[PDB]
XYZ file of C-alpha atoms in Angstrom:
117
model
C -3.596 20.762 -1.440
C -6.672 19.271 -1.496
C -7.062 20.487 -5.345
C -4.777 17.278 -5.935
C -7.997 15.393 -5.191
C -10.569 18.107 -6.342
C -8.959 18.326 -9.603
C -12.248 17.320 -11.442
C -14.920 19.221 -12.083
C -18.692 18.674 -10.357
C -17.897 14.663 -10.469
C -15.162 15.035 -7.732
C -16.072 17.951 -5.511
C -19.887 16.192 -4.989
C -18.223 12.686 -4.611
C -15.940 14.239 -2.082
C -18.395 16.515 -0.313
C -20.257 13.199 0.077
C -17.845 10.686 1.379
C -16.607 13.882 3.554
C -20.089 14.574 5.553
C -21.149 11.033 5.695
C -18.028 9.978 7.544
C -17.330 13.389 9.514
C -21.071 13.397 10.760
C -20.309 9.711 12.085
C -18.080 10.943 14.600
C -14.787 11.427 12.852
C -13.005 13.099 9.986
C -12.073 12.352 6.429
C -8.299 11.411 6.641
C -7.264 9.814 3.456
C -3.397 11.274 3.799
C -1.242 10.913 0.746
C 1.421 8.578 -0.484
C 4.435 8.963 -2.761
C 3.209 12.435 -3.583
C -0.288 11.134 -4.321
C -3.437 11.233 -2.111
C -5.870 8.835 -1.625
C -7.921 8.709 -3.936
C -10.462 6.895 -2.800
C -12.374 6.942 -6.021
C -10.649 4.881 -7.756
C -10.166 2.678 -4.664
C -13.829 2.082 -4.439
C -14.544 1.173 -8.007
C -11.539 -0.975 -7.963
C -12.396 -2.814 -5.079
C -16.103 -3.449 -6.099
C -14.857 -4.533 -9.591
C -13.334 -7.035 -8.175
C -16.530 -8.125 -6.507
C -15.007 -8.851 -2.585
C -12.943 -6.540 -0.254
C -13.033 -9.248 1.482
C -11.264 -11.875 -1.240
C -9.125 -9.530 -2.011
C -8.131 -9.320 1.994
C -7.739 -12.781 2.403
C -6.303 -13.885 -0.859
C -4.009 -11.239 -0.459
C -4.228 -8.979 -4.129
C -3.650 -5.826 -2.313
C -0.540 -6.054 -4.045
C -1.970 -5.897 -7.661
C -4.513 -3.440 -7.120
C -1.516 -1.272 -4.971
C -0.145 -1.405 -8.759
C -3.132 -0.840 -10.394
C -3.107 2.287 -8.672
C -0.167 2.782 -10.138
C 1.767 2.417 -7.351
C 5.917 2.130 -6.984
C 6.917 -1.608 -6.903
C 7.213 -3.616 -3.623
C 3.703 -3.177 -3.224
C 4.660 -2.112 0.527
C 1.862 0.718 -0.311
C -0.609 -1.990 0.279
C -0.424 -2.360 4.104
C -0.711 1.686 4.215
C -4.339 1.111 1.684
C -5.365 -1.388 4.518
C -4.509 0.092 7.175
C -6.783 3.906 6.113
C -9.560 1.760 4.537
C -10.046 -0.348 7.896
C -9.952 3.188 9.819
C -11.774 5.242 6.985
C -13.555 3.353 4.171
C -14.550 0.393 5.656
C -17.470 1.723 7.507
C -18.462 2.659 4.199
C -18.011 -1.089 2.806
C -20.658 -1.833 5.565
C -22.727 1.556 4.351
C -22.783 0.524 0.967
C -22.590 -3.080 0.921
C -25.308 -2.890 3.667
C -27.409 -0.856 1.696
C -27.105 -2.863 -1.144
C -26.475 -6.472 -0.627
C -24.062 -7.401 2.366
C -21.241 -9.891 0.785
C -18.326 -9.566 3.751
C -21.211 -10.399 6.591
C -19.023 -13.207 7.693
C -15.614 -13.055 7.708
C -16.311 -9.443 8.915
C -14.948 -10.856 12.046
C -11.806 -12.393 10.462
C -10.941 -8.351 9.350
C -11.007 -7.118 12.714
C -9.381 -10.472 13.935
C -6.949 -11.227 11.154
C -5.991 -14.741 12.738
């Protein structure tokens, strides 16, 4: 039921087709699973993380709690780990892509993202 995400007209489909092609041709498949009957809407995720001003910052500041709750996920903030796991495997290449295109802010602790220690 991808329509759940494809709901919005010529704003969703365009972004989706793009966010599909770049990733699928990168040698992978666009796997954005579901939780709580809500698909991982990369749109809101991306604009929120960017609005926060630093993916890396949210990571080391552990603010994925309020972020998950900002996406209106159920209490317990347990969905944060899900988000991380999907980000680090799907959306993180897009950080390097987007940030690397405009200005790469996570250029140093990127190592500490791969290695959270």
